[PDB]
Design a protein around this ligand. Structure first.
Ligand SMILES: NC(=O)c1ccc[n+]([C@@H]2O[C@H](COP(=O)([O-])OP(=O)(O)OC[C@H]3O[C@@H](n4cnc5c(N)ncnc54)[C@H](OP(=O)(O)O)[C@@H]3O)[C@@H](O)[C@H]2O)c1
Ligand SMILES: NC(=O)c1ccc[n+]([C@@H]2O[C@H](COP(=O)([O-])OP(=O)(O)OC[C@H]3O[C@@H](n4cnc5c(N)ncnc54)[C@H](OP(=O)(O)O)[C@@H]3O)[C@@H](O)[C@H]2O)c1
Ligand SMILES: NC(=O)c1ccc[n+]([C@@H]2O[C@H](COP(=O)([O-])OP(=O)(O)OC[C@H]3O[C@@H](n4cnc5c(N)ncnc54)[C@H](OP(=O)(O)O)[C@@H]3O)[C@@H](O)[C@H]2O)c1
Ligand SMILES: NC(=O)c1ccc[n+]([C@@H]2O[C@H](COP(=O)([O-])OP(=O)(O)OC[C@H]3O[C@@H](n4cnc5c(N)ncnc54)[C@H](OP(=O)(O)O)[C@@H]3O)[C@@H](O)[C@H]2O)c1
Ligand SMILES: COc1ccc(OC)c(CCc2csc3nc(N)nc(N)c23)c1
Ligand SMILES: COc1ccc(OC)c(CCc2csc3nc(N)nc(N)c23)c1
Ligand SMILES: COc1ccc(OC)c(CCc2csc3nc(N)nc(N)c23)c1
Ligand SMILES: COc1ccc(OC)c(CCc2csc3nc(N)nc(N)c23)c1
Lengths: 248, 251, 250, 251
């Protein structure tokens, strides 16, 4: 019986790379998406071409709301329905945009704190409640202590996610559920970002003056879920090419 | 003219100790409170007896909601209404209770209270404080020295306090150009919960290397007063542990 | 042709497990040792029986002194002499014992504890870099408990904190040369041979994930990840392998 | 009776400002120096003009060596011989220069950089505590806010400063039962090197969010004064950044 993984925000970019690598390793996968239905199904189609009935999609908004807990319960339920088990949860989905101190602000709070922290918390609860090499991997941020200017809410969300990673590692250890993070520095740059701004970031990276591929981020995820990480819990692995070590 | 400070959750315990010490230092104070009206008014009375028209109370729920931004804005407005300025903001108010991951309040409410009080309200209050502004403007966030060795089953509380570290850093960076410093004070064990039995209190006390006792409220307030003072005018983005070595002690 | 790795303090325990796993992955290995000559030679024998001419021993005291730079250069030299290349350095050797603030002299304690845990890693890093399709990296055996240290282990703890600093500074400075520098930070793994069983069990019961210490092989697994092609964007990172021990309050 | 403090490397710059502020606070002081005899004596004479018999100087090399333990014991002993007590130790003296990994002997660089920044502090701490085997005893270590984002090619310096963090934590834990608190102050950019061109000084100044300027020596001293004060008596194992937010600024 193959293990099964849920990957949030898995239609594109880093989440897609993670889904693909888990699938290549032998997992059956739930590809969660919010707006990217076409891309989510295209990925499922590709994975199911390789191995029939090993990939399904699941739609949900992960914005904080009165219905978020039910939405997160259903994401976990979708894995059990499709595959009869849920071994791995990857909290990858994330809103990312500036929120200057000086969309309504309450909506920004709901999206940024919801996707990056509250949904991971609720998914973690539902994952644990429903329960071998069980683990959770949270996509963190190597730059949390040297944050982007005017990204307070995003940064708060990513700090909260560090807190969840630690608290859940502690509390779920008795159940044999490990809880770890992967912290990219600069990986795939935002599609909306200009080419000049992208190159400004790349030239800051000590190791090769380039961003991490999605696959390089996924490699750390694969390690953490693997049998080679069986004693590792509450750890956050930076995958940042030394970017966080570089002073102003 | 005397400077003015807002202290959230200032009716009792650490919040009161901070309000009292700021007042003793020459600040006029807004004593924010949620449910503790009697205690808030009693404190304001004591302070106004010491110096007339130097303390007012301000009631607000800091639970997350769509009106929280308006509530936070009104807290800062109340300081300007009373005193014509707002030099210091102390984010002290905090919900604190367990939220077990594996099994009264709905999870939605728990998220709203624990994340709202510890992180979102601080953020909105920070926004409003900055938007309203020789000078010594600053914000102090009451953090938690144990955030990396958290209490079992307190994930949402811990998440909120981590978020608060993030705000302290992000806001220090962004508000520096406005001369608004943003720092934190991180108690370990200070005043134990009223509902806690003495045996459980003593268990915590005997963990603290420096004197096997909890921090007094005044000791926490002392670090706050330092950070708002002219003796800290180059300090921003710093979180000062006031924990008697507790966070250094392994399992 | 096969890459080559230096592992310090490789004759026994975690260093041996690291040497063995690297060897199983395809590395030729320099098994550095100080006092454990018989165990070092026995391991080299086992590894060479598996693949001929893939293991050598190299003896060196890694206590701080005016000759330590020469000793460290000679360790790296021994890898080039045996194998013609040096792809991986694992800084594992370590003195570990209490040095209370209130038989060995204090100058010897400083020399041993700071030398093995920090200065030798530095000098080995220098010599490794100076001697340099490729995948060059250094892995430093750190300590997950550096911020919640054992009582009366100040010099040891200072050494391990210095090793964190080295890992970071060297990651930064050697990145332009394609040399990655990372760490692995055990919590409780193989307990000291001298420790009494009661105290061993005390430590085991503190670990959230399984109430047991890490095996040497579990520590080695993280080293193998960091030197692998699956870590080629990772530098300046220290991976805790502690079963959650460092998360547990007093 | 007046308390007494030892300040290492106190002839100039930050150490001098610390010595002055301690003296202004009421401390008698041991002004340790290595090469700067004239500056040390000039300070001593200035302080003794203020209050007779309140300042002495103590010469020592704090490079790592076989004799360093004796030298450190003698520094502490000097404070007892001068003043009959030793309440405060400030580990400020520090060698600082690049040590590139790829191309003074290296063993000398090790001895100087690790000796001054880590081993001498450790030995001074041992000696301080052994002599202590109303009171407010404490140690303040001058750390570095940039230890996790170090200058390129300063590995041995950075190693020494990381080691000093370890000492600060380990000694806080171990000495807490004796009532001796151990803390740090971590400047980011404070007084720039004397030779440094203003154009290079400005490159660093412009990076500092809070005021685009370096910390004065006096601002660093202010944080030391807080930590040794009665307002910090629950604070141990804490390192206070005094960096204007520099360490929060990404590349
Ligand atoms: N890229 C980087 O350089 C970098 C750096 C540091 C950390 N990270 C972290 O690594 C992870 C992946 O990064 P990425 O750049 O690949 O992420 P991304 O493209 O910004 O977002 C990934 C997905 O998150 C989903 N998402 C956004 N808002 C959502 C909402 N309200 N509800 C449900 N899903 C929502 C979206 O799914 P749909 O498209 O289906 O709507 C989106 O495709 C994130 O956690 C990110 O913070 C990335
Ligand atoms: N006590 C400790 O040992 C300790 C340890 C570490 C950190 N800290 C931190 O230091 C600060 C002070 O601690 P403390 O023990 O004095 O705090 P506390 O007694 O638990 O709470 C302080 C005040 O928070 C206010 N509050 C709670 N929920 C609120 C809501 N929904 N809306 C508005 N206000 C709300 C309450 O005001 P009303 O009474 O008016 O309802 C309460 O009096 C907190 O931030 C805490 O996290 C304390
Ligand atoms: N074991 C744990 O629970 C644990 C926890 C945290 C971190 N770590 C770290 O992980 C690494 C491996 O731990 P371990 O317990 O396997 O180490 P260990 O047994 O204490 O020491 C490994 C080797 O270090 C060598 N060594 C000691 N002093 C030396 C000197 N003066 N010169 C040269 N070599 C010297 C010894 O080699 P010879 O036998 O040949 O003399 C010894 O076998 C160490 O860096 C340790 O600090 C271990
Ligand atoms: N300045 C900054 O921007 C900055 C930034 C971060 C941290 N810090 C830290 O704050 C502290 C003060 O900084 P600073 O710039 O004022 O220091 P500094 O001028 O570089 O050095 C202070 C003193 O250290 C003494 N010293 C150097 N080598 C010694 C040796 N081998 N033995 C004994 N004493 C020796 C010297 O004494 P003599 O002159 O008598 O020879 C020197 O005057 C240091 O610990 C430093 O690392 C400073
Ligand atoms: C100002 O825009 C910036 C500045 C710095 C950046 O890396 C240091 C990036 C990379 C993209 C990114 C980082 S977290 C993150 N999180 C999500 N959910 N998506 C992303 N695309 C990113 C973008
Ligand atoms: C299980 O109850 C515990 C466990 C550990 C504790 O300190 C190490 C405390 C002290 C009270 C407390 C800490 S954060 C905090 N935050 C608020 N808003 N209120 C409080 N009363 C506390 C209580
Ligand atoms: C009081 O003795 C202790 C206390 C705590 C411990 O783990 C948390 C250990 C495990 C052995 C150990 C840790 S670093 C270390 N370093 C070396 N070179 N060797 C070792 N054997 C160890 C022993
Ligand atoms: C290349 O020169 C540099 C680069 C960056 C710097 O600040 C971040 C400084 C300030 C001086 C300094 C920092 S630690 C330090 N330590 C000692 N013992 N002395 C100093 N003078 C300094 C100088």
């Amino acid at each position: 019986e193959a293990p099964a993984a849920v990957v949030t925000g898995a239609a594109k970019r880093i989440g897609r790379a993670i889904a693909v690598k888990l699938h290549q390793t032998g997992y059956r996968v739930v590809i969660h998406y919010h707006n990217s239905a076409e891309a989510a199904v295209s990925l499922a189609d590709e994975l199911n071409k390789e191995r029939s009935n090993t990939a399904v999609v699941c739609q949900a908004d992960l914005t904080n709301s009165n219905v978020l807990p039910a939405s997160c319960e259903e994401i976990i339920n979708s894995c059990f329905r499709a595959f009869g088990r849920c071994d791995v949860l990857v909290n990858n989905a994330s809103a990312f945009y500036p929120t200057p101190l000086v969309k309504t602000v309450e909506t920004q709070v709901a999206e940024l704190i919801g996707t990056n922290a509250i949904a991971p918390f609720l998914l973690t609860m539902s994952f644990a409640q429903r329960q071998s090499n069980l683990s959770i991997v949270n996509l963190c941020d190597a730059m949390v202590d040297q944050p982007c200017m005017a990204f307070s809410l995003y940064n708060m969300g990513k700090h909260a996610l560090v807190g969840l990673t630690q608290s859940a590692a502690l509390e779920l250890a008795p159940y044999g559920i490990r809880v770890n993070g992967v912290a990219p520095g600069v990986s795939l740059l935002p599609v909306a970002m200009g080419e000049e701004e992208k190159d400004k970031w790349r030239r800051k990276v000590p190791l090769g003056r380039r961003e991490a591929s999605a696959e390089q981020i996924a490699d750390a995820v694969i390690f953490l879920v693997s049998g080679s990480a069986q004693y590792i819990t509450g750890s956050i692995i930076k995958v940042d090419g030394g970017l966080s070590l570089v002073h102003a």
